[PDB]
Short mmCIF file of all heavy atoms in Angstrom, two decimals:
data_model
loop_
_atom_site.label_atom_id
_atom_site.label_comp_id
_atom_site.label_asym_id
_atom_site.label_seq_id
_atom_site.Cartn_x
_atom_site.Cartn_y
_atom_site.Cartn_z
N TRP A 108 -6.42 3.01 3.56
CA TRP A 108 -6.95 1.97 2.69
C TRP A 108 -8.47 2.13 2.57
O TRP A 108 -9.18 2.02 3.58
CB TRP A 108 -6.60 0.59 3.29
CG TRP A 108 -7.11 -0.62 2.53
CD1 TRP A 108 -6.70 -1.05 1.30
CD2 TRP A 108 -8.09 -1.58 2.97
NE1 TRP A 108 -7.33 -2.22 0.97
CE2 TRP A 108 -8.19 -2.57 1.97
CE3 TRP A 108 -8.88 -1.72 4.12
CZ2 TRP A 108 -9.05 -3.66 2.07
CZ3 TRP A 108 -9.74 -2.80 4.22
CH2 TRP A 108 -9.81 -3.77 3.21
N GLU A 109 -8.96 2.42 1.36
CA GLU A 109 -10.39 2.59 1.10
C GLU A 109 -10.86 1.55 0.09
O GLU A 109 -10.67 1.71 -1.13
CB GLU A 109 -10.69 4.02 0.59
CG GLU A 109 -10.28 5.15 1.55
CD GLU A 109 -10.54 6.55 0.97
OE1 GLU A 109 -11.72 6.96 0.91
OE2 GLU A 109 -9.58 7.23 0.55
N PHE A 110 -11.42 0.45 0.60
CA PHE A 110 -11.98 -0.63 -0.21
C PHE A 110 -13.50 -0.40 -0.35
O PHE A 110 -14.24 -0.44 0.64
CB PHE A 110 -11.68 -1.99 0.45
CG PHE A 110 -12.07 -3.20 -0.39
CD1 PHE A 110 -11.32 -3.54 -1.51
CD2 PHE A 110 -13.16 -3.99 -0.06
CE1 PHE A 110 -11.64 -4.64 -2.27
CE2 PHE A 110 -13.48 -5.10 -0.82
CZ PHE A 110 -12.72 -5.42 -1.93
N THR A 111 -13.92 -0.14 -1.59
CA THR A 111 -15.29 0.25 -1.92
C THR A 111 -16.21 -0.99 -2.09
O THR A 111 -15.70 -2.12 -2.19
CB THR A 111 -15.26 1.11 -3.24
OG1 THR A 111 -14.80 0.31 -4.33
CG2 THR A 111 -14.35 2.35 -3.09
N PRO A 112 -17.58 -0.81 -2.13
CA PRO A 112 -18.55 -1.92 -2.37
C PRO A 112 -18.37 -2.67 -3.72
O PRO A 112 -19.01 -3.69 -3.94
CB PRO A 112 -19.94 -1.22 -2.30
CG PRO A 112 -19.65 0.23 -2.53
CD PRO A 112 -18.31 0.47 -1.86
N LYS A 113 -17.50 -2.16 -4.62
CA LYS A 113 -17.22 -2.78 -5.93
C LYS A 113 -16.60 -4.18 -5.76
O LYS A 113 -17.15 -5.19 -6.22
CB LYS A 113 -16.28 -1.89 -6.77
CG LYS A 113 -16.82 -0.47 -7.03
CD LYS A 113 -15.91 0.34 -7.98
CE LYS A 113 -16.44 1.76 -8.22
NZ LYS A 113 -15.64 2.48 -9.23
N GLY A 114 -15.45 -4.22 -5.08
CA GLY A 114 -14.75 -5.46 -4.77
C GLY A 114 -15.43 -6.27 -3.68
O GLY A 114 -15.20 -7.48 -3.57
N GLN A 115 -16.23 -5.59 -2.84
CA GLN A 115 -17.08 -6.25 -1.82
C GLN A 115 -18.12 -7.14 -2.55
O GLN A 115 -18.35 -8.27 -2.15
CB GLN A 115 -17.76 -5.18 -0.92
CG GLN A 115 -18.39 -5.65 0.42
CD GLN A 115 -19.64 -6.53 0.30
OE1 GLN A 115 -19.57 -7.76 0.30
NE2 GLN A 115 -20.80 -5.90 0.16
N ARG A 116 -18.68 -6.61 -3.66
CA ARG A 116 -19.65 -7.34 -4.51
C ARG A 116 -19.05 -8.60 -5.13
O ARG A 116 -19.78 -9.53 -5.45
CB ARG A 116 -20.23 -6.43 -5.63
CG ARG A 116 -21.35 -5.49 -5.15
CD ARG A 116 -21.97 -4.69 -6.31
NE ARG A 116 -23.19 -3.98 -5.87
CZ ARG A 116 -24.43 -4.50 -5.86
NH1 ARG A 116 -24.66 -5.74 -6.27
NH2 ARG A 116 -25.43 -3.76 -5.43
N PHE A 117 -17.72 -8.63 -5.30
CA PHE A 117 -17.02 -9.83 -5.80
C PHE A 117 -17.21 -11.01 -4.82
O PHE A 117 -17.28 -12.16 -5.24
CB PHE A 117 -15.52 -9.49 -6.02
CG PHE A 117 -14.67 -10.62 -6.60
CD1 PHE A 117 -14.71 -10.92 -7.96
CD2 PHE A 117 -13.84 -11.40 -5.77
CE1 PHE A 117 -13.94 -11.95 -8.48
CE2 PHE A 117 -13.08 -12.42 -6.30
CZ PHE A 117 -13.13 -12.70 -7.65
N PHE A 118 -17.30 -10.70 -3.51
CA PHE A 118 -17.59 -11.70 -2.46
C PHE A 118 -19.13 -11.89 -2.32
O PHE A 118 -19.64 -13.03 -2.36
CB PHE A 118 -16.99 -11.24 -1.11
CG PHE A 118 -15.48 -10.95 -1.13
CD1 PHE A 118 -14.99 -9.66 -1.31
CD2 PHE A 118 -14.55 -11.99 -0.98
CE1 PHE A 118 -13.63 -9.40 -1.32
CE2 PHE A 118 -13.19 -11.73 -0.99
CZ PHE A 118 -12.73 -10.44 -1.17
N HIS A 119 -19.84 -10.75 -2.18
CA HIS A 119 -21.30 -10.67 -1.91
C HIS A 119 -22.16 -11.40 -2.96
O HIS A 119 -23.12 -12.09 -2.63
CB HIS A 119 -21.70 -9.16 -1.83
CG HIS A 119 -23.19 -8.89 -1.84
ND1 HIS A 119 -23.87 -8.55 -2.99
CD2 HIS A 119 -24.11 -8.89 -0.85
CE1 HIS A 119 -25.14 -8.36 -2.71
NE2 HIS A 119 -25.32 -8.57 -1.42
N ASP A 120 -21.80 -11.23 -4.22
CA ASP A 120 -22.56 -11.78 -5.36
C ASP A 120 -22.33 -13.30 -5.52
O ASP A 120 -23.11 -13.98 -6.19
CB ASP A 120 -22.22 -10.99 -6.65
CG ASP A 120 -23.02 -9.67 -6.75
OD1 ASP A 120 -22.81 -8.75 -5.92
OD2 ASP A 120 -23.89 -9.57 -7.64
N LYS A 121 -21.26 -13.83 -4.90
CA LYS A 121 -20.98 -15.28 -4.88
C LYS A 121 -21.74 -15.96 -3.73
O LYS A 121 -22.41 -16.98 -3.93
CB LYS A 121 -19.46 -15.55 -4.75
CG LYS A 121 -18.60 -15.02 -5.92
CD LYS A 121 -17.09 -15.33 -5.75
CE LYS A 121 -16.23 -14.76 -6.90
NZ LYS A 121 -16.59 -15.35 -8.21
N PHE A 122 -21.62 -15.40 -2.51
CA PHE A 122 -22.16 -16.02 -1.28
C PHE A 122 -23.16 -15.09 -0.58
O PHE A 122 -24.28 -15.51 -0.24
CB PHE A 122 -21.02 -16.41 -0.31
CG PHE A 122 -19.97 -17.33 -0.92
CD1 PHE A 122 -18.71 -16.86 -1.29
CD2 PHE A 122 -20.26 -18.68 -1.14
CE1 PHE A 122 -17.77 -17.70 -1.85
CE2 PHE A 122 -19.32 -19.52 -1.70
CZ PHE A 122 -18.07 -19.03 -2.06
N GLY A 123 -22.75 -13.83 -0.35
CA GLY A 123 -23.57 -12.84 0.36
C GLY A 123 -23.56 -13.09 1.86
O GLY A 123 -22.75 -12.49 2.59
N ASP A 124 -24.43 -14.00 2.28
CA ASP A 124 -24.55 -14.43 3.68
C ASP A 124 -23.23 -15.05 4.19
O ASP A 124 -22.74 -14.69 5.27
CB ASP A 124 -25.72 -15.45 3.81
CG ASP A 124 -25.88 -16.04 5.23
OD1 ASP A 124 -26.45 -15.36 6.11
OD2 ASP A 124 -25.43 -17.18 5.47
N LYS A 125 -22.66 -15.96 3.39
CA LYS A 125 -21.45 -16.72 3.78
C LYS A 125 -20.15 -15.93 3.46
O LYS A 125 -19.07 -16.28 3.95
CB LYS A 125 -21.48 -18.11 3.07
CG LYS A 125 -20.52 -19.16 3.68
CD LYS A 125 -20.61 -20.52 2.96
CE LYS A 125 -19.76 -21.61 3.65
NZ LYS A 125 -19.83 -22.90 2.93
N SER A 126 -20.26 -14.86 2.65
CA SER A 126 -19.12 -13.98 2.29
C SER A 126 -18.88 -12.89 3.34
O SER A 126 -17.88 -12.17 3.26
CB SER A 126 -19.30 -13.36 0.90
OG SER A 126 -20.45 -12.54 0.85
N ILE A 127 -19.84 -12.71 4.27
CA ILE A 127 -19.70 -11.76 5.40
C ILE A 127 -18.35 -11.96 6.13
O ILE A 127 -17.65 -10.98 6.40
CB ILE A 127 -20.91 -11.89 6.41
CG1 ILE A 127 -22.25 -11.44 5.74
CG2 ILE A 127 -20.66 -11.11 7.73
CD1 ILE A 127 -23.50 -11.59 6.61
N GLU A 128 -17.98 -13.22 6.39
CA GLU A 128 -16.69 -13.54 7.03
C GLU A 128 -15.48 -13.12 6.15
O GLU A 128 -14.46 -12.68 6.67
CB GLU A 128 -16.60 -15.05 7.37
CG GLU A 128 -15.28 -15.48 8.03
CD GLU A 128 -15.25 -16.96 8.44
OE1 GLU A 128 -14.86 -17.82 7.62
OE2 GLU A 128 -15.63 -17.27 9.60
N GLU A 129 -15.63 -13.24 4.82
CA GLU A 129 -14.57 -12.91 3.85
C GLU A 129 -14.27 -11.39 3.82
O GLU A 129 -13.11 -10.98 3.72
CB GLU A 129 -14.95 -13.41 2.43
CG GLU A 129 -15.15 -14.93 2.32
CD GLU A 129 -13.88 -15.74 2.66
OE1 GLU A 129 -13.02 -15.91 1.77
OE2 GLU A 129 -13.74 -16.21 3.81
N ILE A 130 -15.34 -10.57 3.90
CA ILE A 130 -15.19 -9.10 3.88
C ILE A 130 -14.73 -8.57 5.26
O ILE A 130 -14.02 -7.56 5.33
CB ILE A 130 -16.50 -8.38 3.34
CG1 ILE A 130 -17.79 -8.63 4.21
CG2 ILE A 130 -16.74 -8.79 1.87
CD1 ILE A 130 -18.00 -7.70 5.39
N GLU A 131 -15.10 -9.29 6.34
CA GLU A 131 -14.59 -9.02 7.70
C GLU A 131 -13.12 -9.45 7.80
O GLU A 131 -12.35 -8.80 8.49
CB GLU A 131 -15.43 -9.74 8.79
CG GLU A 131 -16.89 -9.27 8.88
CD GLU A 131 -17.64 -9.81 10.10
OE1 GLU A 131 -18.10 -10.98 10.06
OE2 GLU A 131 -17.80 -9.06 11.10
#
Side-chain angles (χ1 to χ4, degrees):
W108 178 68
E109 301 178 74
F110 187 73
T111 64
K113 302 185 181 186
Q115 196 291 94
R116 281 185 170 273
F117 182 79
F118 304 96
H119 168 263
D120 279 66
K121 297 180 182 298
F122 303 105
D124 176 79
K125 197 179 186 181
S126 61
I127 294 177
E128 179 176 89
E129 299 299 277
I130 61 86
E131 297 189 280

